[PDB]
Amino acid sequence: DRQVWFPGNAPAPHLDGSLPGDFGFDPLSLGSDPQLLKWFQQAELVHGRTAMTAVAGILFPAVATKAGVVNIPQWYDAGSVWVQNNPNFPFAALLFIQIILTGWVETKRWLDFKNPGSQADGSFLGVTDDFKGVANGYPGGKLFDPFGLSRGSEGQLQKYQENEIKNGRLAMVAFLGFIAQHAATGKGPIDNLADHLANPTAVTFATNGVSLPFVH
Amino acid sequence: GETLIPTVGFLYIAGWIGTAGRDYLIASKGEAKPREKEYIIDVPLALKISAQGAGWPFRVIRELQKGTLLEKDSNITVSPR
């Protein structure tokens, strides 16, 4: 069959290769229920797209900061810097605005999950065709896909779906690495990369100080 | 604020809990295996019924006025006197 995460091991029997990024990886069998599988597919897609946006918004400002062009604060300090530099914008007001806007869009996504195509009735400002949804976790339409990269050809859509899911998984692992590297070095990720590129034989996890708590 | 407002708060929460339990029992009575839902909880149904217990006094007072809150004495078993 297809390529699997553990060569020589059969894929999970509830994973038949229809979903993008299906490598048969479910050792805990969390996706046995098809409805729970659709829910977890939406979870993986939302997590991966959020991670991709977050990793880009961490990396490109940090790359620009490393070159000396700008002085954008590191990702672990940007909330503090924003609060100290914006006394007229309280934290609670910003949190309330974020919560109501995200609640609107996520409740629309949730109600589409419960009943697909139900947001297509024109109740939101007359939007009908763009809120119908192409597949589970893939809305599409003229609003979410304005360049029409999903409406061209089927094979192009499957290729882009594979690209999206694999880059999303890579970005999720990258954000986990960001957390672990900040907790171990106290520096940004591009700072860590520059330190590794400067002298890679001595700049390792074994020399940060916390991954190996002993002296050695 | 020492006893009276705590009395109102407790009575509201206690009626909430009792009405949620009654609604769950009545809903489970209509199933094919009514005893099954009493020890294997229908968690989505219990969460939906539990959230609906906020409006318990309106529904309970209506059932009291309608006569549907109480079982008739002819339908309840008793011991010989």
């Binding site: 914006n86 007229n88 934290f91 609670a92 629309k108 589409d112 009735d121 | 609906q52």
Partner: protein, 222 residues
Amino acid sequence: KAGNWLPGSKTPAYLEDLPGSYGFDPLKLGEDPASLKWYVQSELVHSRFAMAAVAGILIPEVLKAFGAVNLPVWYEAGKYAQESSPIPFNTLIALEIFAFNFVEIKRWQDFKKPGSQGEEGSFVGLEGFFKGTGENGYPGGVFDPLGLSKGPGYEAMKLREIKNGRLAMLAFIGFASQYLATGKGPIENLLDHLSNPLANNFTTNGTSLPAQAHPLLSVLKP
């Protein structure tokens, strides 16, 4: 149905033909038909009371903001009226109790038996005032002297009354909570929000978000 309060949700079937219905009953309070009739009447009475109250607060407040008149604000208007009132407090309360006992018993009796207050002998000769329209919460008679319920736009006016009523109810509760949290008038609150909407809202009044419940308020500050 005027619409759906939650697009995509399954609206209850008993709210299909009501005026001002968006299918909103997540607590299933109106599932019983008798409860639904009683709550339709209750929503209409609350709506009209809030409508008149919000008018009597906002229109004097807007005229004061424009400088047309100088009337006392709504949270203190009881004090200045009672000092210049020829009728003192206790007899005003007693008269209000008597009058509202009479008129609300008449309204209640019409709710229980529709058209009963318009039959012969229901009043002392003046029962034609209250013949009723045969509809729950829409009395007519003296209460519709211009007779615009017989017009073509009766159903649109029912929808207009209910939606403005819900807006007025939320507006009066907003007035009360805004006074209890900020201590100022409603137009003052509106002008403070318009001057600096990021910093002047409920998140900075010191009441709506208690400090003990939200420890991050004192931490994430300049």
